[PDB]
RNA sequence: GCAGUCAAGCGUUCAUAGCGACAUUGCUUUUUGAUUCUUCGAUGUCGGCUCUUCCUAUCAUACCGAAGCAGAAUUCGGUAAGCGUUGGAUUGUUCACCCACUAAUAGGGAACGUGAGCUGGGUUUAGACCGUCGUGAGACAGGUUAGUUUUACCCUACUGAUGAAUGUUACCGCAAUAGUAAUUGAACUUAGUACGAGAGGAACAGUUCAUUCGGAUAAUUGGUUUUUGCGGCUGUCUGAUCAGGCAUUGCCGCGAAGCUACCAUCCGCUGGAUUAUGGCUGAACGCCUCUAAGUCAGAAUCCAUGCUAGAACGCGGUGAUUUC
RNA sequence: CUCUUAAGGUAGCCAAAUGCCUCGUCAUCUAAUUAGUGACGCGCAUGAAUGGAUUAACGAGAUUCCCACUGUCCCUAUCUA
RNA sequence: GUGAACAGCCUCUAGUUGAUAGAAUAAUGUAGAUAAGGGAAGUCGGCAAAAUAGAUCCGUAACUUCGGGAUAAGGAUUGGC
């Protein structure tokens, strides 16, 4: 996260390291996003900077419109597919790793979102909370 | 604390226990244990698993709860 | 040369030597500071760790998103039977340290404590404290004078206590014994409190109270001679590595032409004596009572004892302590509690706690039920039953 | 390579906020050279992987000072090496050039650390190709491809584990010494306030979280499965059924216990003496001056508190102390 | 135009296993490429049975990219003999 | 016998039951295996390992020395009675 943050984030297990590919949720004309970096990552030798839900990342488009391909853009993660714990005690996970496109200060490039999201993201990125059909 | 029910086995789930799964259609399932979760991933059906509440229901085992609804025979008398 | 990509160290140099403890009972290397105004109380206690369970409560931490909202936490349970007091000793200060000059004991001792002065009990006359006990029976002469000596000297006092092991399921029979410092006032008053509590018992309620932060001390679990990667945390070498890969490759340079104390080598893991602090209490419980695991919300008369007992320990028919988190020590192990040394405000230690629900479900499996009656009502009758 | 002295000029004005010509004094040995002292009855010869430590000529962080410093951002400098200093494309590469994150992506040493620790991509045997040279064999820090990496059971060091003798034996303890660890950031509020014409735009305290590291643990989640525990499946053999054998643990699903993971959870202390610096009183020098005497506050510093081992030749208290 | 040779490198091909300068210039591939591919050519020092250019199939040959795949790795853990 | 098959696995006739043993189950090893989420980020280099795999049916490109490529690619089915 970072500049567009509407607050803080309790930890959640990392599933999305770099070289990862996650489907795109919105109607921006993209299909998949290829992660390369994570805002807020640390620095340890030979550790891969990993992403989780709610995080903002830098990503490219390996499939979609050439209006978006071949450049790097900020993105947000909304589904993780790895079990993570909530402090109410329950572990949960979706079935797919999914994200959207954004500008550095939080606003989305698209207008809509397909499928559900995480409350841990909708509570941190409000513009996502508007264009969300579901929050869980 | 709310006590939830297993989407697969019908058993009861106390907090901090089991898992929760979220499917692409934005639906939710709650599992008590990796057993149920694994069979769900293997896309079995509970109606053919013999230790489930749905099975025991559909086969009318432990079905001594519901008996019948009686028949009324009485005039208006007014 | 100039290590290419700098990185941190693998391991703490402050928990060396990573070796075995000399006694399974760890020793309190520090007691709190005394205030000579308060009443007489203990700074410590002893208990046998039983195991963990699960706990749900409601949070009071404003600013958080989880405010006035349920959260689960994982606690650990300590069987703290009424400890017994046998004797006190007196330390006086020197330029070369606190030094004992007298240890005074009581008259009648139990045959679960005077097994601690033997390595072979079954073949002995048991012949212990038999003359010290005859030192009594003439009113106090050789004893009260020792007490007066202690009052006349001995800026510091420590009380000898022993567990009531027999009330536990264990097969030890050999009481654990320990010195515990007092932090009341008027060393005379201290020793008088003691002399009164000789041959007598002390519960944990007088000492600890709910929502109090403590420190827990114990000998951590043993795993044995272990290698470098799991004793410290080094990298596994790559796959194509002749002569093994769970190793450390460079253990030094040509100069200093020796091997340094700082280098990760192999050896013992576990059975180290450790101290973990700021472990909040969530409950004190009385064994002379059922509904120990009951609350103002659940109100099902069940004990803390899970279904099928605790694993490798048993039942908790005695008093107990339910404390937050994961403390050192495996089950069945002696655990030395301690009050905190400093006052910790923190907005996280002054939190008042009120439980909501407790887990009694089995730990010997994926326990579904919290209670046999619940199980019966859910499943219905069975072939065994009628 | 680094730092100095001076000061002509730049800097609107102004030598010195920051720079700094012509000249000049030095350090260092992380470049390359010069030399040829040691080694040719061999010191295993590039780079990377791993791992520790050290230096400071400090990239960042703590506290401060100066400014051509209004705020913000930024630059010079001081104490300080406590703490941290990345992921990747290409290259055999060191060096390098880019992408991105980051508080930051500083420099270096240790037989140009580290091959009985790895690898062996490169150089640097033998095979082969090309180009140029050569009559030719053949040559080329010119290019390309393929090409055996040995031994530790000895001494020491290190890590851990016992252990004779101290009248015996058992228990409870003290603590000399040694080691030491916690780190950094964001958001909310402070505040669109201070500040400033406006543009723009802070900080202290407080709270919630997070990064890196560490130490424990295993309630839950996940993994593992010779519980060969349950069940199923194939082929075959026991005449058939039941029950089972073999298939280098036959295979599949579930799978307790145990072990374990930032793939799970919890925890990670506060007091004093100081540095730089700013000050008080106050002389020297009838005044003035933080210093000469004396003294106050003050840093991620240092020592303690706390944490870990406990001198096997440091110690104390206590119990019992063999009869044929 | 000129000097000169026995003749003066023709057709073709190229930073190719042959190109010093050199990580050549342009484009594409990539988020990013001293790599790879396609083109340019005053080519240190290409080149015609010292065989030139090309070439389907084949190749335990050298090399780059993509899909699937995965403990190679993030980051290790566990079991068996 | 299974099976396309003197493949591999089991068994009958015939032959061996020989290879220094016993008790425990620490590290490091050799051989074998499994692993969430991601999927070559590792690395000189996808080395090793995994994945795929048989049979029947469908469908099959560029290019071509018209013979091949081609099991191309890429998909479906498979038991017992």
Domains of chain A: 15-136 (2.40.150.20)
How long is the CA A4 to C1' D76 vector, in angstroms? 36
Q: Does C117 touch chain B (CB under 8 A)?
A: no
The single residue listed with the structure tokens 């012949």 is: C127
Phi, psi of C44 (to 5 degrees): -160, -175
**Cα–Cα distance between C150 and C88 in angstroms, integer?**
10
Per-residue CA distances from C45 to B17, C209, C216 (Å): 33, 13, 10
Given the candidates 1.10.472.10, 3.40.1390.40, 2.40.30.10, 1.10.3720.10, the CATH classification of the domain at C16-81+203-220+270-384 is 2.40.30.10
Neighboring chain B residues of C380 at a CB cutoff of 8 Å: 62
Top-level CATH class of C82-202? alpha beta
Q: Does C21 touch chain B (CB under 8 A)?
A: no
Those residues with Cβ within 8 angstroms of residue A87's Cβ, 6 or more apart along the chain or in another chain: A10, C66, C71, C72
A60 strand E contact, CB < 7 Å: yes
Reported residue count of chain B is 78
Method: cryo-EM
A105: tokens are 């200060």
**Cα–Cα distance between A119 and A113 in angstroms, integer?**
14
Neighboring chain A residues of C61 at a CB cutoff of 8 Å: none
Q: Where are the domains of chain C?
A: 16-81+203-220+270-384, 82-202
B14: tokens are 């106390």
Burial class of residue C314, CB neighbours in 10 A (0-12, 13-18, 19+):
middle
A71 strand E contact, CB < 7 Å: yes
CB atoms within 10 A of CB C4: 7
C68 strand E contact, CB < 7 Å: no
The single residue listed with the structure tokens 């700074």 is: C43
Q: Does A86 touch chain B (CB under 8 A)?
A: no
**Cα–Cα distance between A75 and A64 in angstroms, integer?**
15
The bridge status of strand A98-101 relative to strand A73-79 is antiparallel
C110 close to C85: Cβ distance less than 8 angstroms: no
CB atoms C65 and A45 under 8 Å: no
Q: A46: helix, coil or strand?
A: coil
Q: Which of A111, A42, A33, A118 is nearest to A78 (CA)?
A: A118
Q: Which of A87, A95, A30 is nearest to A59 (CA)?
A: A30
How long is the CA C328 to C1' D87 vector, in angstroms? 36
**Cα–Cα distance between C180 and A63 in angstroms, integer?**
70
**Cα–Cα distance between C54 and B58 in angstroms, integer?**
35
**Cα–Cα distance between C160 and C199 in angstroms, integer?**
11
Q: Choose the mutation target among B2, B7, B21, B22 for the interface with A, i.e. most A CBs under 10 Å.
A: B22
The bridge status of strand C320-324 relative to strand C70-79 is antiparallel
The shortest C-alpha distance from C310 to chain B (Å) reads 18
Sign of the CA dihedral running B16, B17, B23, B27: negative
**Cα–Cα distance between A80 and C284 in angstroms, integer?**
41
**Cα–Cα distance between C150 and C143 in angstroms, integer?**
11
CB atoms B33 and C380 under 8 Å: no
Q: Which of C303, C293, C304, C311 is nearest to C365 (CA)?
A: C311
The bridge status of strand A21-24 relative to strand A30-38 is antiparallel
The shortest C-alpha distance from B16 to chain C (Å) reads 7
What's the angle, vertex CA A123, arms to CA A121 and CA A127, rounded to 5? 80
Preceding peptide of C369 cis, ω within 30°: no
**Cα–Cα distance between A51 and A33 in angstroms, integer?**
13
CB atoms B19 and A89 under 8 Å: no
CB atoms A133 and B15 under 8 Å: no
What's the angle, vertex CA C59, arms to CA C54 and CA C65, rounded to 5? 115
Phi, psi of A74 (to 5 degrees): -80, 150
A32 close to A71: Cβ distance less than 8 angstroms: no
C179: tokens are 């010195």
Chain centroid offset of residue C332 CA? 11
How long is the CA C308 to C1' E16 vector, in angstroms? 79
Q: Which long-range contacts (CB under 8 A, 24 or more apart) does C151-154 make?
A: C151/C187, C151/C188, C151/C191, C153/C90, C153/C92, C153/C101, C154/C90, C154/C91, C154/C92, C154/C101, C154/C187
Note the strand F nucleotides within 7 A of protein beta carbons: 26-30, 36-42, 45, 47-48
Q: Which residue of A has its CA nearest to B19?
A: A91
On the CB side of B43, CA atoms within 13 Å amount to 1
| Residues linked to residue C208 through DSSP beta bridges, in sequence order | none
Neighboring chain B residues of C56 at a CB cutoff of 8 Å: 1, 15-16
Dump the DSSP string for C133-189: HHTSSSSSHHHHHHHHHHHHS-SEEEEEEE--GGGSS-S-----EEEEEB--S-HHH
**Cα–Cα distance between C224 and C202 in angstroms, integer?**
37
Those residues with Cβ within 8 angstroms of residue C123's Cβ, 6 or more apart along the chain or in another chain: none
Q: Which long-range contacts (CB under 8 A, 24 or more apart) does A120-123 make?
A: A120/A9, A120/A10, A120/A12, A120/A53, A120/A54, A120/A86, A121/A53, A121/A54, A121/A76, A121/A77, A121/A78, A123/A6, A123/A7, A123/C65
Kindly calculate the radius of gyration of chain A based on its CA atoms and give it in whole angstroms: 14
C36: tokens are 């000579």
Total beta-carbon pairs less than 8 A apart between chain A and chain B: 39
**Cα–Cα distance between C75 and C310 in angstroms, integer?**
14
Domain C16-81+203-220+270-384 shares a fold with domain C82-202 = no
How long is the CA A57 to C1' D198 vector, in angstroms? 36
B69: tokens are 């609804």
């Amino acid at each position: 996260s970072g500049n567009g943050a509407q607050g803080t984030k309790f930890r959640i297990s990392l599933g999305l390291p770099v070289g990862a590919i996650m489907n795109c949720a919105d109607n921006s004309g993209a299909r998949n996003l290829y992660i390369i970096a994570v805002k807020g990552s640390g620095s340890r030798l030979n550790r891969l900077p990993a992403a989780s839900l709610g995080d903002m990342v830098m990503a490219t488009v390996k499939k979609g419109k050439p209006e978006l391909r071949k450049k790097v853009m900020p993105a947000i993660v909304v589904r993780q597919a790895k079990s993570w714990r909530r402090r109410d005690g329950v572990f949960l996970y979706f079935e797919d790793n999914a994200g959207v496109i954004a500008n550095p200060k939080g606003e989305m490039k698209g207008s809509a979102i397909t499928g559900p999201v995480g409350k841990e993201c909708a509570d941190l990125w409000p513009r996502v909370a508007s264009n969300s059909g579901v929050v869980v | 604390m709310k006590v939830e029910i297993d989407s697969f086995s019908g058993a009861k789930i106390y907090p901090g226990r089991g898992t929760l799964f979220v499917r692409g259609d934005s639906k939710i399932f709650r599992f008590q244990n990796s057993k149920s979760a694994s069979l769900f991933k293997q896309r079995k059906n509970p109606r053919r698993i013999a230790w489930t509440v749905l099975f025991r229901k559909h086969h009318k085992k432990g079905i001594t709860e519901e008996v019948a609804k009686k028949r009324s025979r009485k005039t208006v008398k007014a | 040369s100039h290590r290419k990509y700098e990185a941190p160290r693998h391991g703490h140099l402050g928990f060396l030597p990573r070796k075995r403890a000399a006694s399974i009972r760890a020793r309190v290397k520090a007691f709190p500071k005394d205030d000579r105004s308060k009443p007489v109380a203990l700074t410590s206690f002893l208990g046998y760790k039983a195991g963990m369970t699960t706990i749900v409560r409601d949070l009071d931490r404003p600013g958080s998103k989880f405010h006035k909202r349920e959260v689960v936490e994982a606690v650990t349970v300590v069987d703290t039977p009424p400890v017994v007091v046998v004797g006190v000793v007196g330390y006086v200060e020197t330029p070369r340290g606190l030094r004992s000059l007298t240890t005074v004991w009581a008259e009648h001792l139990s045959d679960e404590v005077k097994r601690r002065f033997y390595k072979n009990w079954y073949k002995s006359k048991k012949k212990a404290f038999t003359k010290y006990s005859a030192k009594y029976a003439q009113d106090g002469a050789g004893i009260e004078r020792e007490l007066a000596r202690i009052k006349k000297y001995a800026s510091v006092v420590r009380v000898l206590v022993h567990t009531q092991i027999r009330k536990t399921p264990l097969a030890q029979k050999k009481a654990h014994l320990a010195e515990i410092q007092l932090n009341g006032g008027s060393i005379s008053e201290k020793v008088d409190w003691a002399r009164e509590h000789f041959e007598k018992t002390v519960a944990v309620d007088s000492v600890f109270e709910q929502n109090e932060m403590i420190d827990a001390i114990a000998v951590t679990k043993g795993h044995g001679f272990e290698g470098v990667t799991h004793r410290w945390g080094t990298k596994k070498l790559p796959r194509k590595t002749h002569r093994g890969l769970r190793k450390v490759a460079c253990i030094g340079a040509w100069h200093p032409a020796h091997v340094m104390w700082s280098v990760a080598r192999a050896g013992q893991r576990g059975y180290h004596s450790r101290t973990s602090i700021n472990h909040k209490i969530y409950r004190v419980g009385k064994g002379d009572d059922e509904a120990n695991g009951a609350t103002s919300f659940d109100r099902t008369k069940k004990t803390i004892t899970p279904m099928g007992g605790f694993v490798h320990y048993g039942e908790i028919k005695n008093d107990f302590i339910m404390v937050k988190g994961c403390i050192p020590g495996n089950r069945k192990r002696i655990v030395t509690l301690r009050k905190s040394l400093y006052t910790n405000t923190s907005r996280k230690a002054l939190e008042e706690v009120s439980l909501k629900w407790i887990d009694t479900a089995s730990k010997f499996g994926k326990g579904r039920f919290q209670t046999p009656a619940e199980k019966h009502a859910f499943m219905g009758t069975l072939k065994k039953d009628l």
